[PDB]
Enzyme design. Structure first.
Site, PDB file in Angstrom:
ATOM      1  N   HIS A   1       0.804  -1.225   0.000  1.00  0.00           N
ATOM      2  CA  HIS A   1       0.000   0.000   0.000  1.00  0.00           C
ATOM      3  C   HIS A   1       0.836   1.273   0.000  1.00  0.00           C
ATOM      4  CE1 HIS A   1      -3.907  -1.934   0.418  1.00  0.00           C
ATOM      5  NE2 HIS A   1      -3.390  -2.703   1.358  1.00  0.00           N
TER       6      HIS A   1
ATOM      7  N   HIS B   1      -4.366  -3.288   9.021  1.00  0.00           N
ATOM      8  CA  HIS B   1      -5.386  -3.702   8.063  1.00  0.00           C
ATOM      9  C   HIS B   1      -5.944  -2.486   7.349  1.00  0.00           C
ATOM     10  CE1 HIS B   1      -6.457  -8.060   9.251  1.00  0.00           C
ATOM     11  NE2 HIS B   1      -5.394  -7.742   9.966  1.00  0.00           N
TER      12      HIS B   1
END
Length: 105
Positions: A11, A98
């Protein structure tokens, strides 16, 4: 396991133009439906979870420069989506572990 280390590589991008084609065809992504990358360093993104020890989903106070790689009509072939929006990260031990979603949590 599902923590900041794995969260980072998948990410955290340091360029607005992430080459989905090659990057996502690695075993790290294996060409899933999509993948939202965040144009920002791991530090300022981890700082979003600063002070959050307990697993808690938090929505960012501001928008970040996101680049979302999403599949087109052809498998493992992506369209780059450069945008600016907030996102909710699941903070644990003062680190985003997460990913929840963008905009709001």
């Amino acid at each position: 396991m599902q923590d900041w280390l794995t969260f980072q590589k998948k990410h955290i991008t340091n360029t607005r133009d992430v080459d989905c084609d090659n990057i996502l065809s690695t075993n790290l992504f294996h060409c899933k439906d999509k993948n939202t990358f965040i144009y920002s360093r791991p530090e300022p993104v981890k700082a979003i979870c600063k002070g959050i020890i307990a697993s808690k989903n938090v929505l960012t106070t501001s928008e970040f420069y996101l680049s979302d790689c999403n599949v087109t009509s052809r498998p493992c072939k992506y369209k780059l989506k450069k945008s600016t929006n907030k996102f909710c990260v699941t903070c644990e031990n003062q680190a985003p572990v997460h990913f929840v979603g963008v905009g709001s949590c």
